[PDB]
């Protein structure tokens, strides 16, 4: 069976409990994780240890908190007490875990299921070929010896409009923002990097990225996490918002792909 779980955010206990609920069995089953494995929850170290141990039985995409963790590890960015990353950063296996984490994709595609996954979703300004090239380009920098320069370069809110002519720092920044920070779009597909609220509270003319017709969403289902104020609701057919805010006292949500059956694990917080 195929299971897809939203943002874990260090909620190791809830993750294991939900997987036991569906009797997740590596070798017979595969797990898709929407990223944001770490931060805020208390168990980031245990979560990374377990997901890494799953090997080919897990298909991960990196989220913005995974990238932030990597920026803190590399000395690029300051550690915020509230993220609760210190046990992981001080672990004897921190090197093994984070060097594994930076090698994971930003984008997962299963052609037989016609299923795409990314942390924040797919901007309507990308077709599939472009999304794949963009993921490849950022994954190559993240997996290189020089990844701390990219992590330093990634911070920023501009440019917020895609063009095949983007070059250099702006190109990587847009790609990173599109995969891991996107929520709202302007009618032209342009990214808005400030509004984090539910779509009801969003100011006009902002609309969820999934409310704008785009070539990937027209051919593929898209699963994503990240947007917790969505509470997993209000999406159109074929759009699966999996982040139900477990670290926030919400719930950890698991979707079984074969029968579209949902399983939910309450926050223990
Ligand atoms: O910068 P980004 O990269 O866009 O991401 P982020 O909002 O800072 O954090 P995150 O990726 O964890 O997303 P989340 O919605 O959980 O968190 C973003 C913000 O959403 C808020 N939030 C969580 N649930 C919400 C809800 N139900 N309604 C409104 N806001 C909510 C949280 O306070 C959090 O500060
Ligand atoms: Mn996120
Ligand atoms: Mn998140």
Q: Within a 10 A sphere around the Cβ of 239, how many other Cβ atoms? A: 18
Whether the Cβ atoms of residue 105 and residue 60 lie closer than 8 Å to each other? yes
Give the pair of three-digit tokens for residue 265. Answer: 């694990």
130 lines ligand 1 (CB under 6 A): no
Nearest to 43 by CA among 18, 23, 14, 22: 14
Ligand 1 center to residue 145 CA distance, Å?
Answer: 31
Tell me, letter by letter, the H, E, C secondary structure of the chain: CEEEECCCCCCHHHHHHHHHHCCCCECCEEEEECCCCCCCCCCHHHHHHHHHHHHHHEEECCCHHHHHHHHHHCCCCCCCHHHCCHHHHCCCCHHHHHHHHCCCCCEEEECCCCEEEECCCCCCCCCHHHHHHHHHHHHHHHCCCCHHHHHHHHCCCCCCCCCCCCCHHHHHHHHHHHHHCCCEECCCCCECCCCCCCCCCCCCCCEEHHHCCCHHHHHCEEEECCCHHHCCCCCCCCEEECCCCHHHCCEEEEEECCCCEEEEEECCC
Q: Return the ligand number nearest the Cα of 196.
A: 1
Identify whether the C-beta of residue 209 lies closer than 8 Å to the C-beta of residue 117. no
Please give the Cα distance from 121 to 227 (Å, whole number). 10
**Cis amide bond preceding 13, omega within 30:** no
Q: Is 71 exposed, middle or buried (0-12, 13-18, 19+ CB in 10 A)?
A: buried
Please check whether residue 220 is in contact with residue 200, taking contact to mean a CB–CB distance below 8 angstroms: no
Contact 166, 198 (CB under 8 A): no
Q: Is 198 in the pocket of ligand 1 (CB under 6 A)?
A: yes
- State how many domains the chain has: 1
DSSP β-ladder status, 239-241 and 115-118? unpaired
CA distance 218 to 245: 27
- The Cα 245–Cα 204 span in angstroms is 25
Reported structure resolution in angstroms: 2.0
Distance of CA 214 to the CA centre of its chain: 19
Boundaries of domain holding 50 = 2-266
Q: What is the CATH number of the domain that holds 135?
A: 3.60.21.10
Structural determination approach: X-ray
Distance from the CA of 200 to the center of ligand 1, in angstroms? 15
């Amino acid at each position: 069976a195929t299971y897809l779980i939203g943002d874990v955010h260090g909620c190791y206990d809830e993750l294991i409990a939900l997987l036991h609920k569906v009797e997740f069995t590596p070798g017979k089953d595969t797990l898709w994780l929407t990223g944001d494995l770490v931060a805020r929850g208390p168990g980031s170290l245990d979560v990374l240890r377990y997901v890494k141990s799953l090997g080919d039985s897990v298909r991960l995409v990196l989220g913005n908190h995974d990238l932030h963790l990597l920026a803190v590890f590399a000395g690029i960015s300051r550690n915020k007490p509230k993220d609760r990353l210190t046990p992981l950063l001080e672990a004897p296996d921190a090197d093994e875990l984070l060097n594994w984490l930076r090698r994971q994709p930003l984008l997962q595609i299963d052609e037989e299921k016609k299923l795409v996954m990314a942390h924040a979703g797919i901007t309507p300004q990308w077709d599939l070929q472009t999304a794949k090239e963009c993921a490849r380009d950022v994954e190559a920098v993240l997996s290189s010896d020089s990844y701390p320069f990219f992590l330093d370069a990634m911070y920023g809110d501009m440019p917020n409009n895609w063009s095949p002519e983007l070059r250099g720092l702006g190109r990587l920044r847009f790609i990173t923002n599109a995969f891991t920070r996107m929520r709202f779009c302007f009618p032209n597909g342009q990214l808005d990097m400030y509004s984090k609220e539910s779509p009801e509270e969003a100011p006009a003319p902002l609309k969820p990225w999934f409310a704008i017709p785009g070539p990937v969403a027209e051919e593929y289902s898209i699963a994503f996490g990240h947007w917790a104020s969505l509470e997993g609701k209000g999406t159109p057919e074929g759009i699966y918002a999996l982040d139900t805010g477990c670290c926030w006292g919400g719930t950890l949500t698991c979707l079984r792909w074969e029968d579209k059956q949902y399983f939910v694990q309450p926050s223990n917080r």
